[PDB]
Amino acid sequence: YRELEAFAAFASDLDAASKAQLDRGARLVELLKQPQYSPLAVEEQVVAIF
Amino acid sequence: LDPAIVGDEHYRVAQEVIRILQRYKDLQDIIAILGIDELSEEDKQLVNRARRIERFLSQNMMAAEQFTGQPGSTVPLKETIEAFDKLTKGEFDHLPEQAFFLIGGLDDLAKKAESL
Amino acid sequence: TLRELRGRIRSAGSIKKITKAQELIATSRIAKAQARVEAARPYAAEITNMLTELAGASALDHPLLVERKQPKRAGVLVVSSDRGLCGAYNANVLRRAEELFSLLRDEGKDPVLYVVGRKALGYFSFRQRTVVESWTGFSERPTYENAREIADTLVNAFMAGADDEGDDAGADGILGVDELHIVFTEFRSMLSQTAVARRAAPMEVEYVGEYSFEPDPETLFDALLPRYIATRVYAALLEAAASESASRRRAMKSATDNADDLIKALTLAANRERQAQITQEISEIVGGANAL
């Protein structure tokens, strides 16, 4: 996903699978963020990653 | 070197030559990667002039008699300054580059250029 | 030094990345240009078939069909782009135009020129050459209106040279051209693009060997030819733009390729410099220590 943003930062036309993979990567990166003083248990993290 | 001791023409020609060479050195960094395609013609002209002059600074002294086997030459200063003024004027730009290697005077310059 | 090396490294790295990015811009626009270029084929095919059918059973006589009996002058039109970083595309255009001018100079005719694009306009402005009229701002995206007006201007200019004997404009009242040329570039392949210069001012007819007309046949004929000229002119533009973009992409690709090595070399030099400074400082501190 990073190697593909390094290429397609200015892309308008792409392969459909490439666009889908880029969108999935962006969604996962935006999900991985977590604030401070916020410990989590295992179950909610497993649900979130699923 | 000072205008109080040297003629004004010498001072002016020297200053112009230094400015041209300095400009070429400044643009040498950018031309190293892209080349001449992106560069505008207003600088291509000075690039060609600078290349021709810096090739014209070469000379064939007598000292090489035992290396290249060719006699050397000497030039009076008036001929040198007039020839350099002519070259800075841009009259010689049509002539090929490889004609300016190891030449003594402007007459030999013309003879070599016409010989090719 | 160190700060200069770090600055140059960051500069060259970002230059390389965005050269690749602009190469991607060119690659993306290539698909749109290629899709757009091939949409005018049926109209041209139909109009050519119509002209063949009409000229088959019509009289062969027209000012655009007949030739001026004397070689007075010859016009020409030169096209270009509206953005830089195209490589040698504009250089190729200028070389082809100059070689066509050289070929025409053999007859001693004083030619006239028209230009499209800012780059060629500026280059001819620097040189000592006259210009009649310039068109700019639509090489990126043309339409039918500009092609139609250009064709109209060319047709009227050709017609305005009916009786230009010597320097006299005759009943025309203005000096008119007698010959026209067009110089452009063709899309042979993704890597094959060459300049093509052709002459299409006076029509010529070739018999390869072997309907009903409600209006006047000559009326249909002379209404028809300007449409054919306009269609040819319009068809040239999209081809020129596509070839421009195709040549544009390779420049950015090669720019990235060349940008990598400067990064490599400057990193090596910085490594050597820092190693030297560390070894010299440790040597000097030990030398100061042991002597006392």
Swiss-Prot record, chain A:
Domain of life, source organism: Bacteria
Localisation per UniProt entry: Cell membrane
Function noted in UniProt: Produces ATP from ADP in the presence of a proton gradient across the membrane. The alpha chain is a regulatory subunit.
Family: Belongs to the ATPase alpha/beta chains family.
Subunit details: F-type ATPases have 2 components, CF(1) - the catalytic core - and CF(0) - the membrane proton channel. CF(1) has five subunits: alpha(3), beta(3), gamma(1), delta(1), epsilon(1). CF(0) has three main subunits: a(1), b(2) and c(9-12). The alpha and beta chains form an alternating ring which encloses part of the gamma chain. CF(1) is attached to CF(0) by a central stalk formed by the gamma and epsilon chains, while a peripheral stalk is formed by the delta and b chains.
Name of the protein: ATP synthase subunit alpha
UniProt organism field: Mycolicibacterium smegmatis (strain ATCC 700084 / mc(2)155) (Mycobacterium smegmatis)
Curated annotation (Swiss-Prot), chain B:
Compartments in which it is found: Cell membrane
Originating species: Mycolicibacterium smegmatis (strain ATCC 700084 / mc(2)155)
Record's protein name: ATP synthase subunit beta
UniProt subunit comment: F-type ATPases have 2 components, CF(1) - the catalytic core - and CF(0) - the membrane proton channel. CF(1) has five subunits: alpha(3), beta(3), gamma(1), delta(1), epsilon(1). CF(0) has three main subunits: a(1), b(2) and c(9-12). The alpha and beta chains form an alternating ring which encloses part of the gamma chain. CF(1) is attached to CF(0) by a central stalk formed by the gamma and epsilon chains, while a peripheral stalk is formed by the delta and b chains.
One term under GO cellular component: proton-transporting ATP synthase complex
Functional note: Produces ATP from ADP in the presence of a proton gradient across the membrane. The catalytic sites are hosted primarily by the beta subunits.
Similarity field: Belongs to the ATPase alpha/beta chains family.
GO terms of molecular function: ATP binding; ATP hydrolysis activity; proton-transporting ATP synthase activity, rotational mechanism
Residues of the full protein shown: 356 to 471 of 475
Record key words, sorted: ATP synthesis, ATP-binding, Cell membrane, CF(1), Hydrogen ion transport, Ion transport, Membrane, Nucleotide-binding, Translocase, Transport
Swiss-Prot record, chain C:
Keywords: ATP synthesis, Cell membrane, CF(1), Hydrogen ion transport, Ion transport, Membrane, Transport
Entries under Gene3D superfamilies matching the protein: 3.40.1380.10, ATP synthase, gamma subunit, helix hairpin domain
Locations listed in the record: Cell membrane
Pfam families in alphabetical order: ATP-synt (PF00231)
Matching InterPro entries: ATP_synth_F1_ATPase_gsu (IPR035968), ATP_synth_F1_gsu (IPR000131), ATP_synth_F1_gsu_CS (IPR023632)
Gene Ontology terms describing biological process: proton motive force-driven plasma membrane ATP synthesis
Annotated family: Belongs to the ATPase gamma chain family.
Protein name: ATP synthase gamma chain
Lineage: Bacteria, Bacillati, Actinomycetota, Actinomycetes, Mycobacteriales
Gene: atpG
